[model samples]
Target chain A: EEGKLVIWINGDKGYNGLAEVGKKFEKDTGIKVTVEHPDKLEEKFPQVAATGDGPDIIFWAHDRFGGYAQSGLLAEITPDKAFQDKLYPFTWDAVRYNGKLIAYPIAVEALSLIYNKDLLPNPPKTWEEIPALDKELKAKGKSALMFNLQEPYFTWPLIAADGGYAFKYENGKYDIKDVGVDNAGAKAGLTFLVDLIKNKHMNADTDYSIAEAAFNKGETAMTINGPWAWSNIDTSKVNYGVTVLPTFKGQPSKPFVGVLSAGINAASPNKELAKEFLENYLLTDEGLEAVNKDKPLGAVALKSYEEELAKDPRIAATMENAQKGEIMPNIPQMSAFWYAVRTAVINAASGRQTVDEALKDAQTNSSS
Target chain B: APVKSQESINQKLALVIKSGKYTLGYKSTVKSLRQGKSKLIIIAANTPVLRKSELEYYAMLSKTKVYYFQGGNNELGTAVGKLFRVGVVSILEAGDSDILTTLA
Candidate 1:
């Protein structure tokens, strides 16, 4: 008799769109793999699996892996070092918890700039040119740039532009005690935004819908958002171009990238079979393509998958932009810092607080 | 080796999702479980323990069947045309899936 295995999947249009993976897994292993779609898996997977009633494998965002891995709900996946060599370096770091591999990376998400092609054909390469670029746009009756002004996720390049990070990765460990949100690097990057806003080229009220509409309407020349926004672009009215966010402080703007992955439950009855499934079936070319089908929104680390996706003009630009950004840290300690940082950006954009004050406020406000 | 064609196994699921006898998300599916109207409930295996406990109790009380999806919440959303990740979905009726013979 063949070994039996079970699996769980979160329900999403992209995942559901690529349905043949599990069906193929069932055929190859005769594992009788039963699949389920559950709610709020991120909030619930760890607790549910800790009871030993969950499937042998659970899939979720690697960021949420910290809490689950800490609680021992996740089983460390032991793929030999040779096997791990083929994987992307950043994605490899993503699946490892406390120096142990606990999950399989599937897709990656990051921030990239989208431009109105008619306004600017080639994007500016340095921060020194952006202020004047906005002026050039204004001269043509179009705003130079716009994005979610108060949103930290969209604005992280600024914070990261000057070597500022919520938590510094030092000595091979994330030193949570070392919050760098208010550091010199952060102030410089954010100060640029403040200067842009002060000059009336942009404002704090810019939200996603407004920014997206303005870009598509040709009212704005550029905007900083993610690749997911591409689905809504009306090609007829908007000639869209995708590229990495502009340079900051004479270097790259390292935005945070989020990667989704599947994990093995430490308490499950089918560890060996789960390992086989992840290695042989899930990561294969046929399997990866099926998984990446519906959600063409993000890029995968697999070389073939990367090349295949790069064939699309939009995705090609998105992938190029991804190379310039850095993966988002999955550490749990940084959660509180999001709100604090967003407030600072809002303060700076609205001209209600100085960049120095904003940076100082983020320091103590996130200390808790 | 099995002699069948390499057709996708989810033809039945595709049919039902198209025919419209399913519900997405945990809250809506739980409502059906309480009424004993759900023929099947799919649980994202890593479903949070808070809702997992309740779902376990309801599955037993209603005798509703459950399957653990082999992928994460976002993948589940992809299966159902959801833009966001789906935590749970219920199959109120099986149009043609005898989805059991394959398991058999």
Candidate 2:
């Protein structure tokens, strides 16, 4: 007999797409799939899980599921290694906790530098080159960079490239004891960033929405952003280019990769059925295509799909640079890292302190 | 001689005002209060410290008084609703008198 499968999801893209695919899966497999949306996962997931009445599957970011996995609220799918290999290495790594595969990845997102080709004929290969480019552009009466200084997520890529990783991974576990934010590399990255702000190469007036608008209008030459901005960016106004950030001291800059994975709840009644659905439908070619149709993101799949998608100018540029992207650490301490990084970067960018002092303050605060 | 007790004034009070219920006259005595932008506040008795503190601070700074009515917290909210339904009036303004009769 076909079993009933329940799935919980957030965001319209996943919900709507999954609904369409679930119909096809039911026809083929005779499994009735029901989808539900919850406003607050933290309260709802646990409440339902504690009652042994949660959905069979859930769609969530891997970085966020670490806590639930640690608490044994999620089921470990380590037995499904063969199916896991179908996804990208980064996606698999994201859902793996302590040698067990806990989720199935569907889509991946990475941030990169988007610039106007007309204004910047050639993008800078290193952070140091930004200041000079800014000066040249300003001399010709142009704005260099526009982004929100208030959001550290946007600034973290340059920081990581400059050797400012928030936490170090050892033996597949995050070593919270060793944070690299205030190190020489981090300082160098922040120094380059601050110089841009100080020299009028960048400004804080542009929030995400404002930056996208300005870039579309050709008001700014370059901005640090992500694929989510694609729909809003008016490519017709200016020829734009995307690329991996230039390296510093031979080390390439890494962007933060936000991945969405399919996870099974421990309380699910149809765990086996959910796994089958995940492996056969969600991770399959048809599944990826449906999910990627309207998404402002790339999918995690075999090298074949990667190579084929890379031929499309837009996907190619993003994917080529995505190799340098770092999957966000899924450790529970990630919240502390975000708070610390944001506080430190904003302080430095605002000239409240040197990058070294700002990072040090963040480390101290976050550690406490 | 025993003094006579004055009759308690039965003043009509508004609990809640509908949107665009009243307008301030350019040269009239009654003034209009904007929705979500009122300079006056009314508080029921024994409200939670957090809620009371927040409303009291804003009202005091705007030079208004907290009317400690006899009802419980829920009653005050209900009273506001009833006042709105009956079209009764309660004016909230800096340096306004505690008694509604003074305004009338």
Candidate 3:
């Protein structure tokens, strides 16, 4: 048995926690653990996998590794039946492709509508009410909404709220054969967004950092973001509230849920030991407690850490709303949906075409 | 360098003072100098090698004096902030007093 194990992590928080856990695991098991930090996972993963020199295990978003798994570059862990029930259903489901588990589940996240209660006495609860509230706020010379428009990651929630899904799942996997950009629901959603841009209810340049700054400075009333914003938000001023995104036509708004998981390399010499370490350190009570203490995020084993999170009002709200969110598909074909939605929305917002025309082009191009 | 013509030197010195705007003249200014169309040539502090050599060639060719201004890139930029691209040249006729006054 190889006495040493190696892991590669990308995010700062994850890297730090892994370092701490590596020491503890080494002391207990007498197996050395090494952690590598790579800032650009999108670039690093392909290079490492191509050379067959990647770490024994890697921490990354489940959606990003779909192509790798399909290419047989990743190890499939479904045969290990003993470790199946210890993980959360949603997190485990995110790693499933063709009924095979390709990665070990870690964390789950969903977007929430956050508002500064001091300025907004009544936050809009329905899609229809947003525009009028925006107008009222503008009349008072205030900004009603602020968010990053550089990517669809932040804006897709509104589209989902209107019952617009870019892709559908069939036979237990995402079906990319039919695109939904031009669907009636999608068009309605884009039209609403276009109206917001035209009426100056939303600005294109406001990213999350700027939105958080403005909200803290009392310049904006509300924003749409995930728990990632909690650490940066200023809680000293007014009360803030989190809620499920406002419904459009009575359907709940859905944000893209990004699932982060631990994946084992198929080429690792110490596969069995690596799997043992993962099951013990990541899925056990001590591991969950460590994760909750260091960085309380969307832990996959929510039941184990539910009491700990409930004590924190902000985290509790984030967790409650996340339960109603949809887990984004991790199929390799689903990658096309993100770019298509972004190009379509930008074109509509920039006045290049009517919402219907832009969405139609997106649907055609993405499906093709 | 000794003043080639004292009368011409005084006239050129007077033009720079009265105008208040620093004029940056190039190779063509040499022809203008002999023709009595310009009063002076102001070379940049860190002019590119090509432009500097061209200025020297013109100075030798026209028997004209080239003055070095303390204002480097920043000074030239401030002098012609609106007209010239930053850190580049700002050319003006030395004898054009009205244009100089307007710049001031």
Candidate 4:
């Protein structure tokens, strides 16, 4: 029983993809590998890991690295130079915590303009074109753009296009102390969203459900969403295309980028086995392709697999959009920022507060 | 309490959502909990701590059974055939699903 290595992952894709890799690892090393999906893994990981009885490997998004690393729940790994050079340099940034690599980056994702081919074959290039395009769409009883107004993850790109950011990144580091959500550019970006609703180009009640429903039914022309949405959209069988987010105020909207990675539990007895499985098998091209088969990881980390991944148009488009995106800060303070910004967006969208007042309140709340 | 496999829980949940009368969102769920109208309450793992705490108290007060979904808010939405993140789901009637019978 002690010879068995356990890895925990989320979603069916992980189960399907990683399960295949586990078989290969077991065959190669004669070590049994078990891939398990436990409900509420993220919430339970800290307590379970502290008891030295956690899974040998934990695969998850990098945004939680700050919490895991700070609490010593994740083991630090130093990949050799050869392995390091095989991946996109930006991918490493996501796995790094306190100047140390805590995990191996596996997949990348960012928001893009997902449009219905029949409704809007070609999306606009800038904010100015959106209103004009809406006029034409209205003639057919359709809407131009819609997304979750309250979700900062979807709306942040618009704000970022106008220079709004949660934390300032400079000198190869993110300064959590410097919050920029209340800046003029950020306020202007949000104001544009409000104006779109004010001018009746989009619905004021465009939460994720409303937007997804309208878009899936071909009622809405375009929606800003990420690849994770594909699982739901695929069920609708809508002919859709993905493209880089349109420009706002003549500047490209920089969507927030997230990286999914795998790390060893610091308290695991099979640390060596876990590391070997990650570095020698799971990170290899064959392993990546095997996993991608189960789930289409839009943007991948390894440079060697780029061309292959790009063969899929969705992956190509997501890659292009991610190229224009900024990695989300994984600092502990990011949690506060998400909560505060979401509240601010709700207040602004609901007419409870002006954009300026809402963002300012967000800045105050996040800072505290 | 009886333990059900994740597969059984998920299958039963879909039935409750589609065939039974259910309410979405914390606001509506809280309303159901207050009136003791809900027989079962389901919540996502990532539900805000404050909101989850409130729901827990209301659930106990209303004597309603609670099911903790293993997935995050987004997964819960997907599982329920919704595109948005849902924090709480209140099942007033388990129509085709025996979820209430099994759990109760």
Kept native contacts, fraction for each prediction: 0.00, 0.00, 0.00, 0.00
Residue-wise C-alpha lDDT for candidate 4, range A123-219, written one tens digit per residue: 7888778888898899989889888886788889988997998888888777777999999999988898888888888766778888888888888
Q: Could you tell me the lDDT of residue A49 within candidate 3?
A: 54
Q: Tens digit of lDDT per residue, candidate 2, span A177-276?
A: 8887878888887887787778767774546667777778887788776654654564445778876666666677777777777788764646778888
- Look at candidate 2 and tell me the lDDT of residue B57: 51
Q: Is the docking of candidate 1 incorrect, acceptable, medium or high quality?
A: incorrect
**Segments in model 3 whose C-alpha atoms lie over 4 Å from true places:** A1-15, A26-40, A78-82, A135-142, A234-238, A269-273, A307-320, B1-104
lDDT of each: 0.69, 0.63, 0.64, 0.79
lDDT of 1 by residue, B3-104 (tens): 111123235456667664888777888899998888876654444333766876788899987655433333232343331145467788766666434421
Best by TM-score: 4
Q: Which portions of model 2 miss their true places by more than 4 Å? A: A1-19, A22-60, A78-82, A88-90, A135-142, A171-173, A231-238, A248-251, A268-273, A302-304, A313-316, A351-354, A366-368, B1-104
- TM-scores of the candidates are 0.63, 0.64, 0.68, 0.70
Place model 3 in a CAPRI quality band: incorrect
**Model 4: how far residue B3 lies from native, Å:** 35
| Top lDDT prediction, candidate number | 4
Model 1 Cα shift for residue A349 (angstroms)? 3.4
- Sorted on lDDT, best first, the list reads 4, 1, 3, 2
Model 1 C-alpha RMSD to native? 14.1
What TM-score does chain B get in every candidate?
0.68, 0.37, 0.42, 0.77
Model 1 residue A137 lDDT score? 77
Please identify model 1 stretches exceeding 4 Å from their true place. Answer: A1-13, A16-61, A80-86, A135-141, A231-237, A264-281, A297-299, A307-325, A350-353, A365-367, B1-104
